[PDB]
Design an enzyme around this catalytic site. Structure first.
Site, short mmCIF file in Angstrom:
data_model
loop_
_atom_site.label_atom_id
_atom_site.label_comp_id
_atom_site.label_asym_id
_atom_site.label_seq_id
_atom_site.Cartn_x
_atom_site.Cartn_y
_atom_site.Cartn_z
N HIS A 1 0.82 -1.20 0.00
CA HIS A 1 0.00 0.00 0.00
C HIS A 1 0.86 1.27 0.00
O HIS A 1 2.06 1.23 0.30
CB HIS A 1 -0.90 -0.01 1.22
CG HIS A 1 -0.14 0.02 2.51
ND1 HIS A 1 0.47 1.16 2.98
CD2 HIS A 1 0.13 -0.96 3.40
CE1 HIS A 1 1.09 0.88 4.11
NE2 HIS A 1 0.90 -0.40 4.39
N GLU B 1 1.12 -6.96 8.36
CA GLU B 1 2.48 -6.48 8.55
C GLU B 1 3.00 -7.14 9.81
O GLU B 1 2.23 -7.71 10.61
CB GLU B 1 2.47 -4.95 8.71
CG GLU B 1 3.81 -4.31 9.03
CD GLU B 1 4.84 -4.47 7.91
OE1 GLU B 1 5.19 -5.62 7.57
OE2 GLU B 1 5.29 -3.44 7.37
#
Length: 202
Positions: free
Chosen positions: A9, A82
């Site tokens: 992203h 993440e």
């Protein structure tokens, strides 16, 4: 035989605020949306069979902007989150250096030495992300798909494909947000066809 488009992203509030994210989340910045739009344009021709992202809002937003209404399913996999940064999340770098100076230095300088008490270690991330990737190619024989994930996951993945030891995790090339990396899967092996390409973003 599967073709994997990989990316992470774009810019988020905490990114510019230099606050570490991990499992906590924060919205994309105006720039982050433009980058995704641009990546969405570059892929307008690619015949994507699907899109996989993490369950993180910042990743889902990027995926929706990239899909841009195209008839494409988006699947979310926890294994693409993440790295879980434990106590470090939502805190700035300066703030962290005040708490765990050494761990913080290891994180960036000697990843293989990074051993948090409650966070996640780099090999934990690499392993689960590899599972995700494998299950993804298992479900998309003879197809092309897009994976929107995060900085660290992306790096451990590149490391596995390049056969790089985790101590050289942060070695170049730098992986920009919405950058394009293409992995070709033939006969079960991963070939890095394109890495970190950042045209469209310029």
């Amino acid at each position: 035989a599967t073709t994997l488009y990989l990316t992470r992203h774009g810019e988020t509030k905490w990114n510019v605020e230099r606050r570490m994210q991990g499992w906590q989340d924060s919205p994309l910045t105006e720039k982050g949306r433009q980058d995704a739009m641009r990546l969405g344009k570059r892929l307008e021709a690619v015949e994507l069979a699907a899109i996989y992202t993490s369950t993180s809002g910042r990743a889902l937003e990027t995926a929706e902007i990239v899909r841009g209404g195209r008839l494409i399913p988006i699947y979310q996999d926890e294994r693409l989150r993440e790295i879980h940064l434990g106590d470090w999340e939502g805190k700035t770098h300066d703030e962290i250096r005040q708490m765990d100076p050494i761990a913080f230095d290891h994180f960036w300088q000697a990843p293989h030495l990074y051993a948090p008490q409650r966070g996640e270690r780099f090999c934990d991330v690499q392993q689960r992300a590899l599972e995700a990737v494998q299950s993804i190619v298992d479900r998309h024989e003879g197809e092309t798909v897009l994976i929107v994930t995060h900085g660290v996951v992306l790096k451990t993945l590149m490391a596995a494909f390049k056969d790089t030891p985790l101590d050289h995790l942060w070695s170049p090339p730098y992986m920009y947000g919405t950058s394009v990396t293409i992995i070709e899967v033939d006969g079960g092996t991963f070939h890095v066809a394109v890495e970190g390409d950042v045209s469209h973003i310029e």
